[PDB]
Amino acid sequence: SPGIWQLDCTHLEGKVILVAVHVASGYIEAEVIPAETGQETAYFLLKLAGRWPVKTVHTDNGSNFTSTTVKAACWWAGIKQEDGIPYNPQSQGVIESMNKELKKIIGQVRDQAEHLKTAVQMAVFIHNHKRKGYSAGERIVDIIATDIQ
Amino acid sequence: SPGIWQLDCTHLEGKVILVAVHVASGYIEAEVIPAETGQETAYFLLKLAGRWPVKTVHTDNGSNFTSTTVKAACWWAGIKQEDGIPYNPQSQGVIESMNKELKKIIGQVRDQAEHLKTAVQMAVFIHNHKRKGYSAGERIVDIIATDIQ
Ligand SMILES: NCCCCCC(=O)N[C@H]1Cc2ccccc2[C@H]1Cc1ccc2c(c1C(=O)O)OC[C@@H](CCC(=O)O)O2
Numbered sequence: 009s010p011g012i013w014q015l016d017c018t019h020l021e022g023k024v025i026l027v028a029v030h031v032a033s034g035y036i037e038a039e040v041i042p043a044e045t046g047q048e049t050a051y052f053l054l055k056l057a058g059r060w061p062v063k064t065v066h067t068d069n070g071s072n073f074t075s076t077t078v079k080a081a082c083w084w085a086g087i088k089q090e091d092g093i094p095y096n097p098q099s100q101g102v103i104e105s106m107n108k109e110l111k112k113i114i115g116q117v118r119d120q121a122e123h124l125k126t127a128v129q130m131a132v133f134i135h136n137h138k139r140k141g142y143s144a145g146e147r148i149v150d151i152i153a154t155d156i157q
Numbered sequence: 158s159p160g161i162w163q164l165d166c167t168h169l170e171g172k173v174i175l176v177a178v179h180v181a182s183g184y185i186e187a188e189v190i191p192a193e194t195g196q197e198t199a200y201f202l203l204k205l206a207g208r209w210p211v212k213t214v215h216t217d218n219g220s221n222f223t224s225t226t227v228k229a230a231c232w233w234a235g236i237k238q239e240d241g242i243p244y245n246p247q248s249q250g251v252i253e254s255m256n257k258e259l260k261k262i263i264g265q266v267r268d269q270a271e272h273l274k275t276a277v278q279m280a281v282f283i284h285n286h287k288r289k290g291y292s293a294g295e296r297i298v299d300i301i302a303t304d305i306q
């Protein structure tokens with residue numbers, strides 16, 4: 009499970025925020041895109057997998073699961089593409105809660121940034137640094153280090 | 158040491174590739190930008206620091222060192238902005254060598270991607286995964302995990 013990530017797409021201000029959540033730690037990366045297309049999702053996953061050891065991705069929907077561009081990116085980067093069906097129903101509620109939390113943080117910083125993309129990265133920062141007693145950034149690094157060793 | 162990163166800006170195909178190198182591991186993140194401005198550099202550093210524990214940045218030039226936008230980003234994210242002066246003369250050559258390596262990798266994948274930004278992210282992937290023996294991705298996770306404990 010050190011290699012398992014979940015895709016999550018949420019909306020704000022008429023734009024799309026694409027999130028990848030590292031399931032075991034809660035650590036995230038995110039970007040604003042105009043629209044969630046296979047092309048956008050493929051490029052985002054390429055970025056993600058060059059930065060962390062992404063073994064499995066639970067895709068956020070069936071259009072991205074089906075996407076030949078998304079499949080090509082996953083093949084390229086050595087990612088196993090899986091569906092994101094919450095056979096465990098606590099998974100959907102946990103995502104919903106992170107979307108609400110992220111949008112809350114975005115509102116708290118929104119004033120400090122001219123552009124939504126900036127506020128979203130501020131939100132990624134605050135989320136990954138938040139101590140809950142460790143932070144998500146601390147958990148992911150410890151999970152993967154344990155796994156390497 | 159686990160917190161120190163170096164900025165590096167190189168050029169290809171009439172575009173700019175902005176790189177952040179984690180000094181102790183050689184691990185990188187990179188983006189293509191039309192032009193290196195304070196605004197682009199600020200946004201890049203914000204993203205970086207939300208994803209890894211960035212304590213110190215050796216800026217790549219004096220325009221970014223001076224940039225009020227870059228200083229505002231560094232203040233926001235808790236980054237100490239330093240000059241990138243190679244008091245150790247082996248800095249210039251190690252950076253020059255990675256720029257050469259990255260451009261070589263970009264050439265090897267260039268045909269698999271319609272867009273330069275895609276080839277650059279493929280290059281980040283290959284660079285961070287390359288076993289040299291450990292990879293850069295493995296070293297950075299071990300360095301920071303050791304530091305947390
Ligand atoms: N020269 C022949 C190319 C044949 C392409 C056919 C094909 O499936 N290639 C894949 C191989 C491959 C390998 C890894 C990742 C992606 C890809 C795919 C390519 C691709 C996907 C998304 C992109 C791309 C490009 C690109 O093509 O660079 O570009 C910018 C980026 C911006 C986000 C946005 O703007 O949506 O999204």
Ligand SMILES: NCCCCCC(=O)N[C@H]1Cc2ccccc2[C@H]1Cc1ccc2c(c1C(=O)O)OC[C@@H](CCC(=O)O)O2
Pocket residue numbers: 119120121122123124125126127196197198199200203225226229230233234
């Ligand atoms: N009402 C708020 C006024 C704030 C302006 C004054 C000011 O210094 N703010 C900083 C506070 C702060 C805090 C953290 C990071 C950046 C910033 C700065 C803002 C900023 C910088 C670069 C950007 C931005 C914006 C933005 O303003 O969002 O936008 C998108 C991004 C795209 C890359 C490109 O396109 O170059 O680059």
